[PDB]
Structure 1
Amino acid sequence: GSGNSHTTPWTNPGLAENFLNSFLQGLSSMPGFTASQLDDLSTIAQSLVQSIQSLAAQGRTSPNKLQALNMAFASSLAEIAASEEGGGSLSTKTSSIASALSNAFLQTTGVVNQPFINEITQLVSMFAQAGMNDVSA
């Protein structure tokens, strides 16, 4: 047959793996996570690919299903981001992820979008803080 009019990272397990590989590789050298956390993160990454294959095997991908995978990706980052030994603050960690994401975007599809990366980083910082955990004077 034919098609080719739909190509997205989350939709194709190979493109998803490319995204995760490029992102993880670039993020390790960032002041966000550590090579140690990046190892655990490889497992957390592959767990996405397995679920992507499940849907791809039927040639069906509901928007809300593929989106729930994206929400869960940020959700997973908040857990290891709240964990100790991952740099220092949550703010700098979520900030480094945005910088690693753009580099990964250049490798997956070759197109980086500033606000698309921001909304993704807000999920992590929102999940972790879930209010105002710090004060000011």
Structure 2
Amino acid sequence: GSGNSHTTPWTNPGLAENFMNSFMQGLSSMPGFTASQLDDMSTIAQSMVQSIQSLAAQGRTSPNKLQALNMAFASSMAEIAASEEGGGSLSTKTSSIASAMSNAFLQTTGVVNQPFINEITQLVSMFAQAGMNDVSA
């Protein structure tokens, strides 16, 4: 039904595309990251989008998926955020990630989900320093 809150960018496979594209584009212009790392985030973008593409194509996405995919791509960016190179500390990584998503969602639907951005930045920072996505742990 109509839920005007907690809207996650993975609700629509096309929205995910627009979101992640704008994300990886804008983030490339932000500090902390190096082009070699944006190269991988490009893959993370294409991977997540295609996953949701196939998922929504032959069926649909349940709310449970949103609360899993949010920590999934956070983990794959965590390894990149913890990557040392031209850009500096991880503190500069997560802050840029946060803003990139914000600026992205403004271009796509015009409204940004701040709780989401905070949730993601918590996950990324956590998984990066823990070095795991909770498995065999």
**Is the pair's TM-score, using the shorter chain for normalization, greater than 0.5?**
yes
In 2: Cα distance, 1:58 partner to 1:98 partner = 31
CA distance in 2, matches of 1:3, 1:63: 11
Of residues 52-61 and 126-135 in structure 1, the stretch that sits farther from structure 2 once superposed is 126-135
CA distance in 1: counterparts of 2:19 and 2:133, whole angstroms: 32
- % identical aligned pairs: 96
Ranges in structure 1 where 5+ consecutive residues have no aligned partner = none
Structure whose alpha-carbon radius of gyration is higher: 1
TM-score (norm. length: structure 2): 0.81
Shift of 1:112: 2.0
Offset of residue 115 of structure 1: 3.3
Deviation digits for residues 74-133 of structure 1, max 9, x if unmatched? 111101111221521111211111121211110121112433311211111111123999
Determine the C-alpha separation between the residues in 2 that align with 1:82 and 1:131.
Answer: 9
Structure 2 residues without counterparts, runs of 5 or longer: none
Conservation of the 8 A alpha-carbon contact between 1:80 and 1:86 = no
Structure 1-normalised TM-score?
0.81
8 Å CA contact retained: 2:74, 2:120: yes
Aligned to 1:127: 127
Contact 1:75 1:127 in 2 (8 A): yes
